[PDB]
Amino acid sequence: KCTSDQDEQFIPKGCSK
SS3 readout for 1-17: CCCCCCCCCCCCCCCCC
Name the structure determination technique: NMR
* CA distance readout (Å), 9 to 2, 15: 10, 14
| Residues 14 and 6: beta-carbon distance below 8 Å | no
Of 16, 17, 15, give the one whose Cα is nearest residue 1.
15
